[PDB]
Ligand binder design. Sequence first.
Ligand SMILES: O=C(Nc1ccc(Oc2ncccn2)cc1C(=O)O)c1ccc(Cl)cc1Cl
Ligand SMILES: O=C(Nc1ccc(Oc2ncccn2)cc1C(=O)O)c1ccc(Cl)cc1Cl
Ligand SMILES: *c1ccc([N+](=O)[O-])cc1C(=O)Nc1ccncc1
Lengths: 259, 255
Amino acid sequence: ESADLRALAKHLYDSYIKSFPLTKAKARAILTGKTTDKSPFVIYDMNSLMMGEDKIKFKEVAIRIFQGCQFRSVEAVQEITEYAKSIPGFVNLDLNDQVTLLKYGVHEIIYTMLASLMNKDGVLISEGQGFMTREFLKSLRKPFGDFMEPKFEFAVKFNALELDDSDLAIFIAVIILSGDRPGLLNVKPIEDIQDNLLQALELQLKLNHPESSQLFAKLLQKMTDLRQIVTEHVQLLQVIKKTETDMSLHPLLQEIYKD
Amino acid sequence: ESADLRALAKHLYDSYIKSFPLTKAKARAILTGKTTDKSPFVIYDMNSLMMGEDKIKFKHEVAIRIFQGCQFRSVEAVQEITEYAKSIPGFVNLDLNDQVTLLKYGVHEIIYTMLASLMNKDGVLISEGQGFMTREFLKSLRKPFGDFMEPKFEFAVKFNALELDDSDLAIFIAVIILSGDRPGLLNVKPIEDIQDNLLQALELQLKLNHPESSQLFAKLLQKMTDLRQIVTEHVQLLQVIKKTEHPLLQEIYKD
Ligand SMILES: O=C(Nc1ccc(Oc2ncccn2)cc1C(=O)O)c1ccc(Cl)cc1Cl
Ligand SMILES: O=C(Nc1ccc(Oc2ncccn2)cc1C(=O)O)c1ccc(Cl)cc1Cl
Ligand SMILES: *c1ccc([N+](=O)[O-])cc1C(=O)Nc1ccncc1
């Protein structure tokens, strides 16, 4: 029955709100200059970077940004981990598979939600209190500059779809419950949850964006871009973990990089 | 109006069978030896335990392994309780931060209430009721593990003395979730408005379902002293387990 899938969509959306404090709706308000939200300090140089430390409460500039990009990743993973548990059936799976779904789904999800925080010019940081321009980033020291260029590339293509949070909730869910993840012990129960999620996504996309021809198809196709962006970054780290063997990587993030 | 109260009582029971796989009626059937159709594999010592893994297919040190398997069923319960709560009238209309707060502080109290339905004087149904772990085998676990679940056992025999059925626990569970005294709520009025409704239904339900049982309502609300006291003890023993014992799993099982 059509209407049973609406229940699952509203369920996922509700957990998304509960699990992700910086929704895309909050981000697009900050980024357009709405009055529901307040204005961010923008850093495009070492001066504002250093006035950023003063104004923005947070915790070489090229590594200290990265050390900051890192603790934030940890928080996102913890946030996505909390969201997964809410997906019906996920906690009932084999525990080695739950773990394996999180280890591979997390990066594809990080970059999907990072899109919500980007425009063509830059990205909100520190819960929206900050904004870092694409240019300041591409202008960092030789292994750290290119690091964030392709994420900006994907968000432009992805943000084109004009998804809102209620769509992303279900899409995020589909990403976790994949089944072609390597090492999975029982693909079948994963595949039946995802079959249900895609059904829910399909109805959701068609009702929430009724004039958007093949948005479902276009959206599923975007998992190609996510797959590529992740591998590009996994190699990119490997350069840094050995350019600076004096830069330490957070253990949770490391456990999600079996190379 | 009592016809409205019954309506809500039946609403909740229906939702309680939808949400919770192993009902207390079911758990009783297995435990008594009445329904002899499927009888659960029993774990009474180390040898039976190691055979138990090959028959029951758990999805997860023997004592350390049992604790972790207890943790796995914990996050499953949470998700069933969360799904159940949504079906309590007015729950979802609450401030979303208030819902997360009620659930956050209420899942444990509900976990042990419902654990009591799977227990008796000699042990507990485990897995989906296809196991049974004897209490004496749990007592025999290396410290501090062997004394972890012995306090829960004496709550359950006291709790089960009330002889509550699933339709009672349905409403009783609802009352626990709508506790307007949880740390950091934002709008206590609707929470207490629902709870006084839920208490009214519970009251009329106990009286109709147990006219024999004098003041069972009052006896029931007094047990929520034993619940809060169990929980506060339980939080503390898994903190000295935190000094006795990966990272991804550590995130699924956060406190
Ligand atoms: O910089 C990013 N994130 C953060 C970096 C530093 C930080 O803390 C910080 N900020 C400025 C200077 C030092 N540290 C917080 C964040 C965040 O997103 O929360 C970032 C986000 C998206 C992309 Cl594509 C790239 C980056 Cl480099
Ligand atoms: O045994 C219990 N929980 C489980 C522990 C392990 C487990 O899986 C398992 N079984 C045997 C050995 C290791 N792991 C499944 C359960 C369950 O309740 O479903 C249990 C139930 C009630 C109480 Cl008071 C204590 C425990 Cl330890
Ligand atoms: C077992 C082990 C750890 C925790 N905890 O971290 O709070 C809880 C439990 C437990 O009692 N789990 C359980 C719930 C419902 N039915 C059976 C077992």
